[PDB]
Amino acid sequence: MSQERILDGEEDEINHKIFDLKRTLKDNLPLDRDFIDRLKRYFKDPSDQVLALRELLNEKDLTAEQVELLTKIINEIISGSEKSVNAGINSAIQAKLFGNKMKLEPQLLRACYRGFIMGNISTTDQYIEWLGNFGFNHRHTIVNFVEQSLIVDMDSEKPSCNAYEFGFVLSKLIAIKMIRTSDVIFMKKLESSSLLKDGSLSAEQLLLTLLYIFQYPSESEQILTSVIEVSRASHEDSVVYQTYLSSVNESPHDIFKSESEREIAINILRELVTSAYKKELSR
After folding, report:
1. Which range marks the domain in which residue 129 is found?
2. How far apart are CA 166 and CA 158, in angstroms?
3. Residue 89: closest CA among 55, 59, 122
4. CATH code at 75?
5. Of 178, 193, 141, whose CA–CA distance to 254 is shortest?
6. Backbone angles phi, psi at 241, to 5 degrees
7. Which GO terms describe its biological process?
């Protein structure tokens, strides 16, 4: 149905918002102008407005004349944002499935996928944004939601992107599934090394540190500065460096901008770990 995909209100709140605009047209030939302004205020979202008008087209007989004036309003909203409306309609069942799975407001999820398909930010900045928006806990689930909505958006009769845009969006999603793979790996290293174990360090900021090493491997030493301050007070230095180093070697290679831009990171961690060994075995 076209009503189930409306994420702006409760089950009943949608029924009444739709009947106040079903009774507005039940006048049989009323005022369509300014009634639009009283529909754009019922449902602020373009995906919700368009699905509402689709439910008005499901009832007869009002009808064979104003159905022409109704479908021209639908195309009035859609014409300007065909990608935003289709991305929010197509991914509205997954936003409902996952919004309850993670206990999250569904329209927050539809806005996440809809913003993913038309965002020009690096694969890392995306991962980092979803981490802040949806919390540490939902940093892996949010990428299954995005992937599951993409699978549905494609297999939909009115997708948001064409073959080429759906091809590129998937490469942005393979990378994000690689960032997650090294996130999982790193997390296995943080527990065995048990640095966050005492309570001083947060696993979130520990992760953030790793992401920045992926972005700027040259400033790795400068990056791990905030960690060292909180690390010294309890743990070593050949421990924090070994955690990041062994994590990198067994992580997906393409995460870095290149293979030699990957070297700038492995070499700095190798130089920093061995330089920490001789200043620890020296005392």
Report:
1. 82-170
2. 13
3. 55
4. 1.10.10.2060
5. 178
6. -75, -35
7. negative regulation of protein secretion; protein secretion by the type III secretion system
How are the residues of the chain apportioned to helix, strand and coil, as percentages rounded to the nearest 5?
60, 0, 40
With residue 4 as reference, give the H or E element that holds it.
Answer: none
Q: Could you write out the DSSP letters of every residue in 109-149?
A: HHHHHHHHTT----HHHHHHHHHHHHTTGGGTHHHHHHHHH
How far, in Å, CA of 91 to CA of 116, rounded? 12
Structure resolution, Å:
3.0
Return all residues near 152 (Cβ < 8 A) that are at least 6 apart: 90, 91, 93, 94
On whether the CB atoms of residues 38 and 12 are closer than 8 A, the answer is no
Helix (H, G, I), strand (E, B) or coil at 60: coil
Task: Give the total number of structural domains in the chain.
Answer: 3
Q: Give the type of residue at 2.
A: S
Distances from the Cα of 161 to the Cαs of 81, 117, 118, 170, in angstroms?
A: 12, 8, 10, 11
Experimental method: X-ray
Instruction: Give how far Cα 218 sits from Cα of 200, 206, 250, 261, Å.
Output: 27, 18, 20, 9
Q: How far apart are CA 153 and CA 156, in angstroms?
A: 5
Residue 148 sits in the same domain as residue 176: no
Residues 63 and 121 in one domain: no
Residue 282, H or E segment: none
User: Nearest 10 degrees: CA dihedral of 127, 130, 131, 132?
Assistant: 130
Q: Give CA–CA dist 272/241, Å, rounded.
A: 7
> How far is Cα 283 from Cα 279, in angstroms, rounded to an integer?
7
In whole angstroms, what is the distance from residue 8 CA to residue 134 CA? 19
Same domain, 73 and 93: no
